[PDB]
Amino acid sequence: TQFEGFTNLYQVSKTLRFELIPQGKTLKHIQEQGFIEEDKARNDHYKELKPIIDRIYKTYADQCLQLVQLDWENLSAAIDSYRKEKTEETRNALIEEQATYRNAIHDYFIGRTDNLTDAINKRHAEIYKGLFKAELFNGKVLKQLTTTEHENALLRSFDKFTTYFSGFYENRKNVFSAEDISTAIPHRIVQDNFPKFKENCHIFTRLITAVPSLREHFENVKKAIGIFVSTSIEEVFSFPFYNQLLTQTQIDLYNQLLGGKSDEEVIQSFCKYKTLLRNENVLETAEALFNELNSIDLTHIFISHKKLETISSALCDHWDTLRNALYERRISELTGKITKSAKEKVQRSLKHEDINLQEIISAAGKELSEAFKQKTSEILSHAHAALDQPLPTTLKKQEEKEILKSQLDSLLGLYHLLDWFAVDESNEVDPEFSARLTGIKLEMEPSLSFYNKARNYATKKPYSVEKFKLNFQMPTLASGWDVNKEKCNGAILFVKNGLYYLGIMPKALSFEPTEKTSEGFDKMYYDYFPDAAKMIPKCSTQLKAVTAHFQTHTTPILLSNNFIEPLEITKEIYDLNNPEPKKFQTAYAKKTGDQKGYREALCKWIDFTRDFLSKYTKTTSIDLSSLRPSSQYKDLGEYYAELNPLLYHISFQRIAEKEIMDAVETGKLYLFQIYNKDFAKGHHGKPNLHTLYWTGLFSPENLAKTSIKLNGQAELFYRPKSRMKRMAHRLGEKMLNKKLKDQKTPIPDTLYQELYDYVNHRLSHDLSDEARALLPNVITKEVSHEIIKDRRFTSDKFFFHVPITLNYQAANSPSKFNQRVNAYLKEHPETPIIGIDRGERNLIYITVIDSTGKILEQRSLNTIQQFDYQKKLDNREKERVAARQAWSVVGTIKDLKQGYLSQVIHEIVDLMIHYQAVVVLENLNFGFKSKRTGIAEKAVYQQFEKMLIDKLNCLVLKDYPAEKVGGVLNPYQLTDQFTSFAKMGTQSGFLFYVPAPYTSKIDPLTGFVDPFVWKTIKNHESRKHFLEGFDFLHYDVKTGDFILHFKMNRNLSFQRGLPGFMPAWDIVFEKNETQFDAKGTPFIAGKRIVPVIENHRFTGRYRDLYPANELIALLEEKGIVFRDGSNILPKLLENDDSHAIDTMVALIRSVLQMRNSNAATGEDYINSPVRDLNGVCFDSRFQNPEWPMDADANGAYHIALKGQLLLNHLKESKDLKLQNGISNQDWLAYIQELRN
RNA sequence: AAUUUCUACUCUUGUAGAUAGCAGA
DNA sequence: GTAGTGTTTGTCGTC
DNA sequence: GACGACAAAGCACTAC
């Protein structure tokens, strides 16, 4: 079992796309008969007919909901018990109780409820059966419930084309489904409206009991409107009335008892909604509500737990402070011996409960109220200052786009503020406050969709990719390529001079083949026979005439209808097909074994099949002699696995050029050249993968032995043109490049446009200082030939979609792919490992490690195909965001990252095959990535991992030959088929996923990590404790380095809870000597880039810091003797100076900071604070090639080491299974012990 | 700035990589 | 008239 | 225990 043998494991289906160029006079014939216009109306009716069809669903669903009568007492008790006890047993009890009620509603739809009689119950089943297929159009379902002529004309527009509603059928199943999905009617009744109605009944009785006069007052409101005349006010707040609140008309009446495409379109609609906010005075109402909070009872104003951490980060130092302050005050009011169990109960309570505003203020201090007041007025003033600010006239200028976004940010800011308060009725909400808040919260609700609509309008491309499929009045066009079904599908293919053509017969063309010597096209003859397990009984035994004759009368028969010679069927072989489980099937093997009867039945069936294939019309000559004798086959399985591949075949027969060309002239054939930019006249270079798929499908070897099957169900399309502002490079102008002379640094976007206007003599202004300096370095080109910016959408285009099945000879689905991969990895201990980590100074960095741990190659992936993506392109695009912060610039970056990740896919698969390695990514469930990194978190990288699995699902390298494995005919199968993001584990074929955290902040030489969390210590007293835990600090005179001994069994409150190996450490203040690297460049050893500037501004600017030089400067000023090598900590503690004790902790902060990054001066290195067994401190500035070169190298190096940990456990464990993740402590113990 | 179309691009009337379509979020 | 044009079934695999 | 995968067997109804 070699690595190179991971081919032909399971089938992979892909769909190709091509542009059909009308050849000859086929364009005139199409327009003359108007297929395109008729098809345009049909897609443009797919919108007129949809509301008409919905009348059937709406009426039938409404009618079924009118008879629903249920007892909701059980559902209420399950809701109460879950709110009472928050245990997993009461949750599962509620989930089952909800599923029971959803099915009770579902049984009204399908007709399986005991509440209705059989006559009514069965009538619904006859409707629900044909409710999601072509029976909607019969009028039959509407006959159970009258069409107009225009509606009838709209129904017939989809004659032989109702598959256009394929996805729509699924959307309507989501409406009537009984599953726990929010698109469904049962879910809306059971899990959405009833908890609201159940809460309404509780709010009602509490008010009536406290204020009984409110009862007659509520009754007067109901009588004064006229709703629910036959129902009193107490009954509408009782459970039985909810059965009459299941239809929209009743829901509307219930709610009324409670309540009583273009540029100017975004301006007219927003200003209309904007001017509506003034008339409702929602700002004045909101400003009055937040002003009430200064005097009203704050123990009944609740903050949502889903927003508490967000509020903490917006009003306090960190997200932690609020949850922690509430934790300390609640522990402060526990009873008796406060165990660690009681503390964990307080922790879990704070995760899922709403906190009242008073408990927050009493726990956080008066400085939260000032933060709450300041943030509230800040948001309210911005929304108030935006409602009176008028919108611009157009969105032509970016300055006019900015003010539209600025006002939407103020509107979304107020909308964000209102969602701070808990909405659920589980809390004791204020009467007036909850009503006034919910009113303005729902009146600010449309502002969220207005933010998203406007952004998509500005970030959309100037094209119009919308398109409608072409049917040519044939419902089953391109459904199948077979010659027998050629007539009824009207789709064929050709080939001539290496150019592939598609032929369509519009509303017989008896093509007469000619010899190969005659010039012309080569028609593809497609012969297919789906499966012998189903075709042969259908065509031989289960014929209607044959079955009826044998059931009644017992004599045999010679079948001479559609057969080259009569075939024969005896009485017994029909009984073998239909016994009194089938005998030739594995019936005896499953139960009641009989070997003698089995083989006789098996051999009779197989010999029948061979005779039938010889006598059937089109299978009479398809290589039937290659079958191996019948009597010794084990079962039908290995026969059909051998018979089905032979049935599929493709042949090419020459057809005269005159016949095809004249056929197009007379209008009986619609030629269409398949064109995908790889058949152009100027094409010189390696082609697209899909072209190789298409070229390899018709290669002589593929027809000889099938590996890529040409599936049916192909589709055609037509894309109307959409040109708004055609811009092109006409002759006589100058085409400026987007890269400099070195061909790797892109020009900034704003500067390139200015230079393009200047070099072309169109800029009326003067080049800026930076623009002028860039002029001598840019290259210009004359317009040799005319170029159109996005020529694709300038004119109408046809499109052809065709599916292919790669690895057709393999199984349908993979069978234990991970087990096979693990088995190979077990027997090949020398396999290398590939790790990928997103760096801060570069997008992607990769390191490959051998079996025993040494690095074979560390590379930066920010320069792909002679183009720098991170250092220049993403950085200047990032610079644009800081300058503008508009919507369009945000869209460009997201598109660019996806384009970058496409390039990275090629390098991973290329490097993998060269090393035959397993690539270890980082799983996204665990950890979080810093904002300074180029690639976003879990947004674009999560899609990138899926694209890697899909690429390796069927991997082809376009340089590899077709015959050799790794090519188009025999693609690699290196990963299992993708199922879901959540379903995938730590291993998917040759891809391993490891936890991201603790991979960069680690010394590669020692495995050391910063053992202290710096968030814990703020106070002077904690600084005394922190520096007391350390054993001793002394100045080694011989080496000139301070040594700080630390023991992991101390300062447990300041650690992070991850001891690891190495019970004792020696943190050293290495001397600031001018060391030299491999290249000879000088640097100062021990240099640290620390960002500590202010208490609130700890990141604004970076400063050079030298721990050795600042420590000796501090000790000298304090007059603390250190040349003798004596302990320094006892002297500092007994000296008792606040400044020295404070500064020393910051120095310990600095030394422990391995990550040193400075964007301006271009340093990114890791300097270790501890020495390894050799007695040398790691410093990546030395550029040692056997250790990580840069900081981003360390992250990729340790991610690959984490994958090595999983692979090592694979080898040591007897079973072929992997641990479901690895703990942080285990990883720390592994790396620290390994380096010892 | 020309692409089945997506990104980036222009010695090269195109280059390099990706690309499972269809309907609905 | 009469066949040329223009929905249903076969065991599977998959669940 | 119902849903795809395909053709080819199965019924209408009329152009010829």
Residue numbers in the entry: 2 to 146, 150 to 264, 324 to 570, 577 to 649, 652 to 1307
Sentences from the paper on this structure:
We captured transient Cas12a RNP association with this substrate by introducing a disulfide crosslink between mutated amino acid N551C in Cas12a and an N4-cystamine-cyt(7) DNA modification. In all structures, the PAM sits in the Cas12a PAM-binding pocket. DNA in the candidate protospacer region is progressively bent and underwound from structures 1 to 3. In structure 1 and 3, key interactions between Lys548 and the PAM are absent. Adenosine in position (–2) on the target strand is 4.5–4.6 Å away from Lys548 side chain, placing it out of range for hydrogen bonding. In structure 1, there is no density for the loop 571–576 containing the Tyr575, and no side chain density for Lys613 precluding further interpretation of those regions. Gln656 interacts with the (+2) phosphate in structure 1, and with (+3) phosphate in structure 3 due to general PI domain shift towards the DNA and DNA bending, which brings (+3) phosphate closer to Gln656. The presence of full base-pairing without alternative base conformations in structures 1 and 2, where DNA distortion is less pronounced, suggests base flipping arises from protein-induced DNA bending. We propose that structures 1 through 3 represent progression through a conformational landscape of protein movement and concomitant DNA bending.
